[PDB]
Design a protein around this ligand. Structure first.
Ligand code: ARG
Ligand code: ARG
Lengths: 337, 337
């Protein structure tokens, strides 16, 4: 497999669940300052075999993601899938949100965006009725196109954590790495040059946040990035193992740069051709390497019967201080004027 | 204080020492692949109050370093200070080398350089007879000028760990942050521009490595960086809290750029004026923030009687994958053709 996989024993899974439940009892919320600070140390109490996996697999050169299988989820206890992310912090999902944050603490510094889902650190992925054909993660009938998470931003995550609360019909997450086996050197050269525009995706629009937030000064920075994007490279670092920054629906070549356009067009076709599926079954967690891979989600027919697919999500950086310019009165919720 | 300080209780210090001693019994060496991989997980067994300090203090916005006081060191057990770093992996210093690596594992990914002290991850700082007036860390009579560690390299450490094995005469480490209170905005503007040359320091020369290593292809990259340095910025990131990349003895303005030169000259004087002292007494460990501060060491008269000042040192990055281009057949020992 192109990802690294770990399966918890039932005993390990129960121990991790018990730890998350204890945290849920002792702390008021996941995104509170106290649990944000404490979670990385509390995570040291997770099962040792899991801690070893996370410490080693993060340092491997190859995987597109780290996948942890086997966290129990009781649908009766969980309750119905929320109709919107706003109302998605349900008591039934609370322990699992704490669990995701504990796992994330083993990989780095968690953070959110002032301009996405009301500045929440733990976010939700679920289908919103009426929003089936949008470019945001609450779509369904329209495939969520492949992307580097928050591609527009230099402060985008190193890892994106996804915990599947439920996924009864096995809807696939999509993944692709750099198509290095098919990129000729001239095309590769051009992708390494600062000749591309990457604009913020629609999740950072005021319309996709609550009316109270509309509001925040950080939406100004989003507008600046959308209106006047700075040319950047799609590939960076080592030519034999490049890091990737692209969004199929929000990337463009620099104004009138047809050579850059050709390179982006070639990249699109090669990523489309190599895209593969990872199904996060109920209880599965994935930490996608946001530098090695783009990801998306297959089109699916939403149910709207209370049992729709539902993920908790979290952004993770290896170094919070990289984003200090965007510390919006809060180091864990990023944005700029 | 401009650094964050933690003092171990005797019980905590003894527990940490016992853990390091256990590691020293079970592993062949600190730089072996096994302990490199295991140390970050074994470090989860360190005293909880220390783990909390390291997890929180790393995320604070202000400190120039994280300092841990109170590790016991028995001079009789330690033995005499080595005459050279080559011979400095003495049995008496072995547990303390493991201790340094355990502490470092709480902050990030440790690594070394193919071209410095024979590619060792745990390195040594001690005075070498005949080398009193050099620009390397084995100097004594000549002050070690302030510097960002490995300033020339984009893969330089985020944190530099220093453990004082002995320092009987209390020789000071020097530190300085960005002199933001005195830099005018025009000068600040220029320091943020890619108008400066930073060459590799003398520790990366073949003459300062063993004759067997002279040898390695990675010295080619050092020569390239010395002969044809690429213009880079001294300050990066947030203008209200910039990150710093400079070396007093190995920095220069870009060819004929007198405005850049003026900015560097002003910076020199302001750093010289704000330089302060941190004395690492026997058993003290410091993790210097290599982005917020430059550091050095005061001139001292060497003893050469077997009780000279002696530190173990280690480079730490928040993300090993940042340096994958420089993974020299080994992700933990960096260098390039
Ligand atoms: N090509 C795209 N649709 N990009 C945007 C991805 C989805 C966005 N990050 C969200 O959570 O809604
Ligand atoms: N300005 C300087 N002397 N810079 C070089 C610093 C010392 C070097 N990192 C060493 O270990 O020897």
């Amino acid at each position: 497999r192109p990802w690294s996989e770990f399966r918890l024993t039932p005993a390990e899974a129960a121990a991790a669940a018990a730890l998350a439940a204890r945290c849920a009892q002792r702390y008021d919320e996941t995104d509170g300052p106290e649990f944000l600070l404490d979670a990385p140390v509390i995570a040291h109490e997770l099962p040792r075999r899991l801690r070893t996996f996370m410490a080693r697999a993060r340092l491997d050169a190859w995987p597109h993601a780290l996948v942890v299988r086997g966290n129990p989820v009781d649908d009766a206890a969980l309750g119905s899938t929320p109709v919107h992310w706003r109302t998605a912090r349900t008591p039934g999902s609370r322990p699992l949100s704490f669990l995701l944050m504990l796992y994330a603490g083993l990989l780095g510094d968690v953070f959110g965006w002032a301009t996405q889902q009301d500045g929440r650190v733990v976010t939700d992925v679920l289908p919103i009725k009426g929003g089936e054909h949008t470019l945001v993660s609450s779509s369904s009938r329209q495939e969520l196109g492949w992307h580097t998470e928050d591609a527009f931003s230099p402060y985008r995550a190193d890892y994106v954590g996804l915990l599947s609360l439920r996924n009864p019909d096995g809807v696939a997450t999509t993944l692709a790495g750099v198509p290095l086996d098919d990129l000729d050197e001239r095309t590769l050269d051009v992708l390494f040059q600062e000749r591309f525009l990457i604009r913020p995706d629609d999740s950072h629009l005021q319309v996709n946040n609550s009316t109270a937030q509309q509001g925040r000064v950080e939406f100004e920075g989003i507008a600046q990035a959308a209106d006047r994007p700075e040319p950047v490279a799609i590939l960076t670092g080592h030519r034999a193992a490049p890091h990737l920054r692209v969004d199929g629906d929000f990337s463009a070549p620099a104004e009138g740069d047809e050579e850059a356009a050709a390179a982006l067009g070639t990249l699109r076709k090669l990523i489309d051709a190599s895209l593969y599926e990872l199904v996060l079954d109920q209880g599965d967690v994935a930490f996608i390497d946001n530098r090695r891979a783009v990801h998306g989600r297959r089109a699916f027919q939403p149910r709207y019967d209370g049992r729709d697919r539902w993920l908790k999500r979290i952004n993770i950086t290896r170094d919070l201080h990289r984003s200090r310019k965007a510390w919006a009165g809060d180091s864990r919720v990023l944005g700029q004027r």
